[PDB]
């Protein structure tokens, strides 16, 4: 049942158990196993486990991590994924010296937008896009991983879970406690990730929810009714908020060119209706020369 | 924003086919009948009221039960367990705050233990291969509702009410796709409240016309007219409240002038 997999080494502690790297003894296939301990007297098969599986079984795309098998014992539930060299977070860290070349940043963004677009097309919100949840291989592919916080939305959306998205990557419509969020939250995250790729550091590294907003208001100006109708009536907007002027956008990520600036700005747009979709973003001039380089590892 | 609206509609319309039970699985069940199935779904409606679960969670569970009974043969004494496990799985998928397993043990008057409910969850999961993201009548109504001229919540609540009545009666509604039941439901509700018809814009969107919805419509119309006399009554009681604008107390039209 599990006898065919040979555990090689540990690969990154995964909150319902540990995540290993394993080898199929018969085919030679390299895989990543994600253990899920069920116990006795608990609340049965976890809902994150239920969601991650069902939606991942629907998401067959080059830029989304591939679920291969769910080994379904009564004692434990193992999840078998395709294995990839490392996650984006660790890649940037060992590149914190001489940076990541622009063809590769361009390529990583392009593929991510492709994976994201496939998700939103299949009524799925990721809700946890951060570097440690994006995986890279030896050849220059990048992939959406960690669908533990994903859900399947409806048209039009209902009120979903509020506690969603890792702080630094959390959109300002969530922070303001809105009745409804949607696909834009994933696009907000990618924009932060886009910038994070250029500078190698987090764009908005806050240590509380109030600190996060203000950091965004200094970078992008405090939103008002004209830039975002409905903004001052949102449940957690306070009239006390300092009204920061909007800075020159070239100053947000200095190294970006005209096309990159344009695209990021449309991604970090305040009004979620006017934020660029992953769909449209694929037609942006920034991707006119997109190639598929190999990263050095 | 329309942005991904059409894409999702297509994908749902693709997935609703794959997520279908078998038309007459009840034929081959050696101990259970439609009438029993109808007693289970009616009770699950009460279960959703007592816990304030989304109508979608109800719809999902019925789908899980129907797919499970299409491939697994079940005695009557275990039909409530499969019903319960279904509700729990649906709750975990769809709700922000699913109730705990003890609650699902409780509502069955302790007919089954916590282990039975848990062990059953694994069976249901194994049999459905973990494909739980099933399109539903509700997912479709919701979309159809965006085409109202203009928004009228009496029409919405009524269509939801009609759409819920269809879960009860395997015969005939198992023959129709969710998107189809939703077509008839939305039009019949539109007609009862405003006198209006299935709108052009939904013809462009769905491919469906008033002629192709015809067989489903006149099934539903008899169901609607006959509703006051059904063995199962939970839905009529449900849609009597202000939360649903009392739509189950509206006068249905005696003909549909087709």
């Amino acid at each position: 049942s599990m006898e065919n997999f040979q555990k090689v080494e540990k690969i990154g502690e995964g909150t319902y158990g540990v995540v290993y790297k394993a080898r199929n003894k018969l085919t030679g296939e390299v895989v990543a196993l994600k253990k899920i301990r069920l116990d006795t007297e608990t609340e049965g098969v976890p809902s994150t486990a239920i969601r991650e599986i069902s939606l991942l079984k629907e998401l067959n795309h080059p830029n989304i991590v591939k679920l291969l098998d769910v080994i379904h014992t009564e004692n434990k539930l193992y999840l078998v994924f395709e294995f990839l060299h490392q996650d984006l977070k660790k890649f940037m860290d060992a590149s914190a010296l001489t940076g990541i070349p622009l063809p590769l940043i361009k390529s990583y963004l392009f593929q991510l937008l492709q994976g994201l677009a496939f998700c939103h097309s299949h009524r799925v919100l990721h809700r946890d896009l951060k570097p440690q949840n994006l995986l890279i291989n030896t050849e220059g592919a990048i992939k959406l991983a960690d669908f533990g916080l994903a859900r399947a939305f409806g048209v039009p959306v209902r009120t979903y879970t509020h506690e969603v998205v890792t702080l630094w990557y959390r959109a300002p419509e969530i922070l303001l406690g809105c009745k409804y969020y949607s696909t834009a939250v994933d696009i907000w995250s990618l924009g932060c990730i886009f910038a994070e790729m250029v500078t190698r550091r987090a764009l908005f590294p806050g240590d509380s929810e109030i600190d996060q907003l203000f950091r965004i208001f200094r970078t992008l100006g405090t939103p008002d009714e004209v830039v975002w109708p409905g903004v001052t009536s949102m449940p957690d907007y306070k009239p006390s908020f300092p009204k920061w002027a909007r800075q020159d956008f070239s100053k947000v990520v200095p190294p970006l060119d005209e096309d990159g600036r344009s695209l990021l700005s449309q991604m970090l747009h305040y009004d979620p209706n006017k934020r660029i979709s992953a769909k449209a973003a694929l037609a942006h001039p920034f991707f006119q020369d997109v190639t598929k380089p190999v990263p050095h590892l | 924003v329309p942005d991904y609206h059409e894409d999702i509609h297509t994908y749902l319309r693709e997935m609703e086919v794959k997520c279908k039970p078998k038309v007459g699985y009840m034929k081959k069940q050696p101990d259970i009948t439609n009438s029993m199935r109808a007693i289970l779904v009616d009770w699950l409606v009460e279960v959703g009221e007592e816990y304030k679960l989304q109508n979608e969670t109800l719809h999902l569970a019925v789908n899980y039960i129907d797919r499970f009974l299409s491939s697994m043969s079940v005695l009557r004494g275990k039909l409530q367990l499969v019903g319960t496990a279904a509700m729990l799985l649906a709750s975990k998928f769809e709700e922000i705050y699913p109730p705990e397993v003890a609650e699902f043990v409780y509502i069955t008057d302790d007919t089954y233990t916590k282990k039975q409910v848990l062990r059953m969850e694994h069976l249901v999961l194994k049999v459905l291969t973990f494909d739980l993201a099933a399109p539903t009548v509700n997912q479709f109504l919701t979309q159809y509702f965006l085409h109202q001229q203009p928004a009228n919540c009496k029409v919405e609540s009524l269509a939801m009410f009609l759409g819920e009545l269809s879960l009860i009666d395997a015969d005939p509604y198992l023959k129709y796709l969710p998107s189809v039941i939703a077509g008839a439901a939305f039009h019949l509700a539109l007609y009862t409240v405003t006198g209006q018809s299935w709108p052009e814009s939904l013809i462009r969107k769905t491919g469906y016309t008033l002629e192709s919805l015809k067989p489903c419509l006149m099934d539903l119309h008899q169901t609607y007219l006959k509703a006051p006399q059904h063995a199962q009554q939970s839905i009529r009681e449900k849609y009597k409240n202000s939360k649903y604008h009392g739509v189950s107390l509206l006068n249905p039209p005696e003909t549909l002038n087709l």
């Binding site: 533990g148 506690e163 890792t166 | 009438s35 029993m36 009770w43 007592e50 009557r76 069955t108 008057d109």
Partner: peptide
């Protein structure tokens, strides 16, 4: 560097299936 955000009016009844 910061974790992901993680998560009787009606009486109980044994259903009677008569036929």
């Amino acid at each position: 560097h910061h974790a992901s955000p993680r998560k009787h009016t009606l009486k109980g009844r044994r259903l009677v299936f008569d036929n």
